[PDB]
Amino acid sequence: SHHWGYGKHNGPEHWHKDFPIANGERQSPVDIDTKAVVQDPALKPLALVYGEATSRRMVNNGHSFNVEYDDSQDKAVLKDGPLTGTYRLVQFHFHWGSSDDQGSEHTVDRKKYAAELHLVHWNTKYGDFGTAAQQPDGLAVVGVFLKVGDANPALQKVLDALDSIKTKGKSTDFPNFDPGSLLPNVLDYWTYPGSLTTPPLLESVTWIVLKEPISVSSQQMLKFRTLNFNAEGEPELLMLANWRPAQPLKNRQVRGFPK
Ligand SMILES: NS(=O)(=O)c1ccc(C(=O)NCC(=O)NCCc2c[nH]cn2)cc1
Ligand SMILES: [Cu+2]
Ligand SMILES: [Cu+2]
Ligand SMILES: [Cu+2]
Ligand SMILES: [Cu+2]
Ligand SMILES: [Zn+2]
Incomplete structure (x- = not known):
């Protein structure tokens, strides 16, 4: 079975063979060069309205694990920040590395954290996550580093x-x-x-x-690495690392709030 991953033959450097957009003009993650960050007065504080969030289940999808949220209604939403409109929380998941000195996707002046949490949201103007995922203003992901x-x-x-x-x-x-x-x-x-x-x-x-x-503690980081990429019955493949490295910025602008 051919499906992608973070291994010797199916890893990030190969993904462009199966998904050509991998070498596109707006790929993530990126390194955030803090000296180059732009201040934009249009940016607002983030509004993360999660009081009525309804988590459902935790799932191993064979590349990470997702905590899934009910996104059938406006129960947990993200707005303001850089965004126009309302973005519904659908899931969160993590990326991590094989040792504590690596594992974040984004980097800050080339510094890597041990892991990175991604809270995934979709623009309610599109009706569903799948439709939103195909539009430039469709998704908003909040990344949080684990140090x-x-x-x-x-x-x-x-x-x-x-x-x-x-x-x-x-x-x-x-x-x-x-x-x-x-x-x-x-x-x-x-x-x-x-x-x-x-x-x-x-x-x-x-x-x-x-x-x-x-x-996060070092002990806790061990726990991430106990997961398996494979299905039960298949050869064991520990989920030791599941991060994509920084991609070329290509003249995009990183903005910072409040600077
Ligand atoms: N690492 S990341 O850039 O943050 C990220 C990467 C992939 C996906 C993705 O393709 N994720 C499918 C998914 O979560 N599908 C929801 C299906 C759905 C619709 N309504 C309820 N569940 C989401 C986020
Ligand atoms: Cu795969
Ligand atoms: Cu392939
Ligand atoms: Cu898969
Ligand atoms: Cu849906
Ligand atoms: Zn992610």
Whole structure:
């Protein structure tokens, strides 16, 4: 079975063979060169309205795990920031690396964090996530860095479930998780127009990368790496790393709020 990943033969450097947009003009992630960041008075503070969020299940999809949210109504939305309109939360997931010194997708002056959380939202003007994913203003992903140092109790609630979804296709019920519990205390951000960081690599994402990381311990990072890319019965392939490296900026502009 041919499907993509982060291995020797199916990894990021190969994705362009199957998804030519991989070498497109607005790919993600990117390195954020802080000396080059532009101040734009049009940018607003982020509004993350997650009080009534309804988490459903946690799923191992064979490339990461998603905590899925009910997006049938305006229950958990993102607005303001760089955005026009309302964007509904559909899921969050993580990327990580094989050791604590690497694993974030975005980098800041070439510095890599241990992991990166992605909160994925879609523009309600399009009716559904799939339709939104094919438009330049269709998606908004909030990225949050995980910085190694101190264990994160809110994150531990997520990690406590991973033993239930060790393998590809496994899912587990995962109710009453507040995705706001994984945000930092300050919501300063960088923003730029980009893409999904995995296949299908669609150039529909307004990226909103928070400046302030949340914590994670080294012990906690071990837990991410216990997942399997493969389905049960197949040869074991540990989910040691699942990050795409920085892609060329190509004269896009990174803006910063409040500077
Ligand atoms: N790493 S990243 O750039 O943040 C990212 C990469 C891929 C996808 C994606 O293709 N994700 C499918 C998905 O989550 N599909 C939702 C299906 C759906 C519709 N309504 C409810 N669920 C989303 C985000
Ligand atoms: Cu795949
Ligand atoms: Cu391939
Ligand atoms: Cu897959
Ligand atoms: Cu849907
Ligand atoms: Zn992601």
